[PDB]
Amino acid sequence: VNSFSGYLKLTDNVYIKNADIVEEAKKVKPTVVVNAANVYLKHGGGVAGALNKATNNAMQVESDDYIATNGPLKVGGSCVLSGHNLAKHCLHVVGPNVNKGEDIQLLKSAYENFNQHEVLLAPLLSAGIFGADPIHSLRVCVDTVRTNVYLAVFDKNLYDKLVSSFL
Numbered sequence: 001v002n003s004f005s006g007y008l009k010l011t012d013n014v015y016i017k018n019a020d021i022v023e024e025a026k027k028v029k030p031t032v033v034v035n036a037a038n039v040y041l042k043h044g045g046g047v048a049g050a051l052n053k054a055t056n057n058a059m060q061v062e063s064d065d066y067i068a069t070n071g072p073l074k075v076g077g078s079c080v081l082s083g084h085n086l087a088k089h090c091l092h093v094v095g096p097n098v099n100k101g102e103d104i105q106l107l108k109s110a111y112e113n114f115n116q117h118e119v120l121l122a123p124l125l126s127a128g129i130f131g132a133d134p135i136h137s138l139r140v141c142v143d144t145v146r147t148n149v150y151l152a153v154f155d156k157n158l159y160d161k162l163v164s165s166f167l
């Protein structure tokens with residue numbers, strides 16, 4: 001038993017809710033919250049900008065030190081940093097950005113990072129401003145992640161379409 005509430009159960013291991021990931025994180029304080037990161041960990045907008053704003057920019061300060069030491073992530077890659085006031089840890093995962101021409105096949109590699117963590121609160125990778133079809137992203141998630149994932153979907157309209165079209 002864990003503290004996630006109100007989720008619809010899609011599969012053995014995937015759950016979905018219409019929620020603001022920032023507010024969900026604030027209340028659950030999960031072990032891991034996933035950020036929809038870019039390779040530079042520049043958290044300017046989308047999920048990343050919202051998470052970072054909720055940390056009062058501490059996420060960005062930590063991220064800038066990480067990049068200065070290690071250089072950029074790979075598309076499809078990830079790193080574990082602090083969860084600040086939102087979670088114990090933040091798993092920064094880089095899904096492909098269709099609006100930059102990145103290969104959508106890398107979405108599966110991005111979701112594979114989730115398998116290193118037993119339980120996660122996460123957004124749909126490559127959705128929103130990253131330009132992928134969220135229905136495709138949900139399918140890849142279900143077919144790739146084997147650990148327990150609680151998906152927060154900000155847009156209520158989108159949430160209903162994802163549920164109603166789920167096979």
Ligand SMILES: CC1(NS(=O)(=O)c2cnc3[nH]c(=O)[nH]c(=O)c3c2)CC1
Nearest residue numbers: 020021046047050127128153154155
């Ligand atoms: C498919 C969807 N877009 S998104 O990329 O996942 C996203 C973008 N910005 C967000 N800002 C925020 O404050 N809370 C969020 O949950 C959030 C989620 C509708 C979820």
